[PDB]
Amino acid sequence: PSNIAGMIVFLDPGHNGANDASIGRQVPTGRGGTKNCQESGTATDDGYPEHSFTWDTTLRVRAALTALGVRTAMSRGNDNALGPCVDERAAMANSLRPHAIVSIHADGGPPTGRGFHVLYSSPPLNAAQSGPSVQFAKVMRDQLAASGIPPATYIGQGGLNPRSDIAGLNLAQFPSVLVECGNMKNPVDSALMKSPEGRQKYADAIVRGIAGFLGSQS
Ligand SMILES: [Zn+2]
């Protein structure tokens, strides 16, 4: 898509490369409650961690966006130390007033279920959540599915998953979606996630979703 160079994308590779006791501290959810600052994240049965999958996949997304002239910033800068709380990741995104926010995750579900789901804030708390973020979720879902990655068989509908319990989505004031790429407990998704080429496969599809949404906003 044209007229996307110079637009701003905030990238959030879920979880931290290391955790301490401060991840249990309570932070606001955006709907009047609190939850833990951070969670360790899930892992494959044999211990490949979500935080490394999201980190490396996000680096691949960033490189492709840079090649398109798209500005990026990331919520964390390594995969071996503490990272920001879930409310802080939303605050970092909001401080940038970006055109798009993508948080990248991997899920833990029943081992026979595989595929992606795209989460978005619902019920919406502001205009970005009510309109553009819903459109972004659909474009992202379409591009993941067009890439041959099946929509999740075990949660959501057709790969879309309206959610009220994600602090980073609730607190965003700019277009924002969270991509659960697959189920780390499933043999196919875990094998893809453990491979550099599989992580590139997820990244390429996410980039198509981002670029398609950015182009639609122009
Ligand atoms: Zn996660």
Author numbering: 37 to 254
Publication excerpt:
In addition, to have a complete structural view and to compare the Ami1 structures from M. tuberculosis, M. smegmatis, and M. abscessus, we have also solved the crystal structure of Ami1Msm at a high resolution. Ami1Mab shares 68% and 65% primary sequence identity with Ami1Msm and Ami1Mtb, respectively, while Ami1Msm and Ami1Mtb possess 79% identity. MSMEG_6281 (Ami1Msm), containing an amidase_3 domain, is dispensable for bacterial growth but ami1 deletion mutants present an atypical lateral branching and a defect in cell separation and septal PG turnover. This mutant is also more susceptible to antibiotics due to increased cell wall permeability; a phenotype subsequently confirmed in an independent study which also reported the attenuation of the virulence the ami1 mutant in a mouse model of infection. While cell division was impaired in the ami1Msm knockout strain, this phenotype could be rescued by complementation with the orthologue gene, Rv3717, from M. tuberculosis (ami1Mtb), suggesting a similar mode of action in both species. Furthermore, ami1Msm has also been shown to be important for biofilm formation. In M. smegmatis, deletion of ami1 increases type 3-3 crosslinks as compared to the WT strain.
PG remodeling is performed by numerous autolysins acting on specific substrates and at different stages during bacterial growth. While glycosidases, such as muraminidases and glucosaminidases act to hydrolyze the glycosidic bonds between the carbohydrate units, peptidases, such as N-acetylmuramyl-l-alanine amidases, l,d-endopeptidases, d,l-endopeptidases, l,d-carboxypeptidases, and dd-carboxypeptidases, hydrolyze the amide bonds of the peptide stem at specific positions. Ami1Mab and Ami1Msm displayed an overall globular structure comprising a central β-sheet (β1, 4, 5, 6, 7, 8) surrounded by strands β2 and β3 forming an antiparallel β-sheet, six α-helices, and one 310 helix (η1). The catalytic zinc is coordinated by the highly-conserved triad which constitutes the amidase_3 motif signature, namely H25, E60, and H115 in Ami1Mab and H51, E86, and H141 in Ami1Msm.
